[PDB]
Amino acid sequence: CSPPGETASSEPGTTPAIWTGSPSPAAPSGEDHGGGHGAGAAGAGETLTAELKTADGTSVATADFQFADGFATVTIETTTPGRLTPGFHGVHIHSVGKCEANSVAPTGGAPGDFNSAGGHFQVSGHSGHPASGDLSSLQVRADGSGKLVTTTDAFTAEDLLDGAKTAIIIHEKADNFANIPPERYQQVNGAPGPDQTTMATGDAGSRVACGVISAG
Amino acid sequence: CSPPGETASSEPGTTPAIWTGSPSPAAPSGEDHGGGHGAGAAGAGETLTAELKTADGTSVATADFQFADGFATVTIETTTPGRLTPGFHGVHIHSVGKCEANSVAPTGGAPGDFNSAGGHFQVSGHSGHPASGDLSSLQVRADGSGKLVTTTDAFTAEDLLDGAKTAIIIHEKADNFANIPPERYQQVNGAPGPDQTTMATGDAGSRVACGVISAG
Amino acid sequence: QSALLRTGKQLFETSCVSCHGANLQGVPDRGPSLIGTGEAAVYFQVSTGRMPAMRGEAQAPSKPPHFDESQIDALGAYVQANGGGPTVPRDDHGAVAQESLIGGDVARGGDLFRLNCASCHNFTGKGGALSSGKYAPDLGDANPAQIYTAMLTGPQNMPKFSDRQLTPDEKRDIVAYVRESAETPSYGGYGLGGFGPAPEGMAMWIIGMVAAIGVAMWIGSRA
Amino acid sequence: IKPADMHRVIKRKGQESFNFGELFAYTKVCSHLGCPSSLYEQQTYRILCPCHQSQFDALEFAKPIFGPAARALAQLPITIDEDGYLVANGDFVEPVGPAFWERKS
Ligand SMILES: CC(C)=CCC/C(C)=C/CC/C(C)=C\CC/C(C)=C/CC/C(C)=C/CC/C(C)=C/CC/C(C)=C\CC/C(C)=C/CC/C(C)=C/CC1=C(C)C(=O)c2ccccc2C1=O
Ligand SMILES: CCCCCCCCCCCCCCCC(=O)O[C@H](COC(=O)CCCCCCC[C@@H](C)CCCCCCCCC)COP(=O)(O)O[C@H]1[C@H](O)[C@H](O)[C@H](O)[C@@H](O)[C@@H]1O
Ligand SMILES: CCCCCCCCCCCCCCCC(=O)O[C@H](COC(=O)CCCCCCC[C@@H](C)CCCCCCCCC)COP(=O)(O)O[C@H]1[C@H](O)[C@H](O)[C@H](O)[C@@H](O)[C@@H]1O
Ligand code: HEC
């Protein structure tokens, strides 16, 4: 006999729609928490990234700051192809983590990503030299990508989980951090030294990108 | 019968001297060359590190600059525990690779690690903006370690193997690279703009560490 | 060289344009199209001898070659200039590479010959039957460049194992296997073909069992 | 399949979209007695098996043209993945190996 399930030519099929493959609940016996580490303190993990947001809500860069072996490793990679400008960018840790479009903690003009309660996110007793608020440069070449992987041991996972969450910001200019020599330069008031605003944070423009470091 | 090779108590042995284990000529069917890559040009590899030497011949840091995927990855790690000072350090690529204790290519005072034929190791036709000679900061915290991993696509492996080999240097100060704003600052001659020496390289002190990038 | 293309055209006009239409087309139901098949295809199909053929049958079989190596380059470069496709691998002399094609591995070639094609031929590369009159041929009388260009542009009923289906490492590896499987001697006796049990049966009967019954009739009498 | 020969194809039921353009995926284990039918003839489009020499039509669906087999050798659905890689669009619609009692309802 002939087998019953054959011989039916309809219209010869739609082309098979692209395999949007579902994820895998075979692996799913495991929940990815904040991470696993030591840190004999109030408690933290070993991995907490960040998403740098612009003034339109879109992502510009992506930071990842975490304590691994007593050294806060911070890797800032690019997110968009044409976000940053053709030049060096100055990374700086802000004390408040609000990446608002227009906000100002003190009485003054609300600039772009200026929701911090001051400048550099230093220690709770530190106000002077280049602490954990100031960071190295993540320069953007003609390709439009700024990557900077550094290891700053000034802060750790117990310092970034404060009462106010911190952030990582990048302006349209580079990172100066009081790089004015007093032997040849001069101030507008004739002073040999630099300004206090240039001592708190680096000399740059308005903050273009900003991202909260609370696992963003 | 009793076996012949027993029963001899001499002085009960020296303690066994520490196992300085010899390397392995079991693996040795293979020769580690400069590397393997594409680079359809005169010819280069994909791995060429550097050894930053100080004014006494000792190593201070260690650089590794190589072309991987059209982006020159440069990772500068520390070598000594107490070489750098407590502050930010400015990495800068020098055109000549001589890490001499006292040398000067032009007519002038020979400074520390100033054997370059100018400032930044830019392109052969580039003399203006922040090219591949200027680099990001490798800041040294209180632990005394400066690490900076970046990806600069301005140069490649075909540009670092020039007629004169290049170098990577770090001074005692940070990296400015003409970070003086002309709206509030001023010059000694009353000029609004910056100096040409601050436009060629960053505003720092004397170059403390320097290492040739020709697989040092 | 353009004179080499002209030599290919002179040999092309006076051997095949009854079945390839002289514009490298296909004469319908008499000989198929020929562009895009390329220099590798013409090297395998004339260097073996097959395509300067004489009837359209079940399959056009092997035969002595109708042109020599000084002219196969002309004919294949002519068909590649009119069309364009796979080319025959050539060494540092410009001639057709035949010895630089044996790859450095055999066991990978054994497993890959065995998986991908030895269904059709045999294990050692003897022939195999195919559907309606067509048949796989023996791989013993096979130049290694003809083996590479045989799997590279599949002539008749074999899949064209392309440059991307099998990588040239794998194809050099298969021609390393078949030039040391159809060349190595049968370890441990006469090789009754390459395929086992049917020649072993027929050589059990007339060699072994006929001798056994002959001994049995020399020993015992008849009555 | 060579795309000059895509007008000769006639699919069967529940199986019209199991191509991918001209990519077909037929199983290698044959219809009856389970040998791999790894002989394939282009330009005639017949999956021939070696063990009992049973042809199958590569064009329409692997119906046995000739041989001791009487069942369509099974066809696997095809799509491309994200990043453009060939993936199976599910399982076979029929049990793929040789025949036995519990089949075909
Ligand atoms: C004697 C007879 C079998 C009657 C039994 C009763 C019968 C009614 C039972 C039912 C059987 C019917 C219904 C179906 C048939 C199925 C069959 C009988 C399977 C059972 C197995 C077995 C009993 C087979 C029969 C016996 C066998 C064929 C006797 C051999 C032939 C003769 C009489 C012996 C002398 C031959 C000897 C001198 C060698 C001569 C050389 C010739 C060319 C050998 C022929 C030959 C043979 C026989 C091969 O088997 C063979 C296998 C693989 C490759 C090649 C050959 C081959 O060339
Ligand atoms: C005395 C001192 C002790 C010495 C040892 C003696 C034992 C013999 C083993 C020694 C090594 C010889 C085996 C060689 C190695 C070997 O395998 O033997 C091949 C088989 O070839 C052939 O048939 C051609 C051979 C023709 C000769 C005569 C045929 C034998 C007959 C008598 C057998 C009877 C069978 C029963 C008949 C049935 C009756 C029908 C009515 C021949 O190799 P060759 O010719 O060179 O090439 C192959 C290509 O044939 C092959 O198509 C190609 O594919 C490759 O295999 C290639 O290597
Ligand atoms: C001690 C007596 C000697 C007999 C020895 C073996 C008998 C053992 C019987 C024990 C199990 C009884 C039923 C429960 C076991 C059971 O459930 O399955 C049956 C598995 O029994 C079989 O193997 C063979 C018999 C099948 C049942 C009926 C067969 C006898 C009758 C119906 C045939 C005679 C009349 C028809 C024509 C006769 C000849 C010509 C006229 C049928 O397979 P199936 O129907 O494919 O069901 C699938 C699930 O298995 C699976 O989970 C699930 O995935 C399902 O999708 C499906 O695949
Ligand atoms: C049907 C499936 C088929 C498979 C698959 C196949 N072949 Fe072929 N092969 C043939 C057929 C049919 C011919 C003859 C074509 C002709 O005569 O034009 C042939 C020709 C050849 C020849 C030429 C023999 C001679 O005398 O010149 C060689 C060698 C060969 N094949 C080796 C291979 C290789 C290598 C592969 C791939 C690993 C392969 N076969 C896969 C069927 C097949």
Ligand code: FES
């Ligand atoms: S074994 Fe392939 S069909 Fe019978």
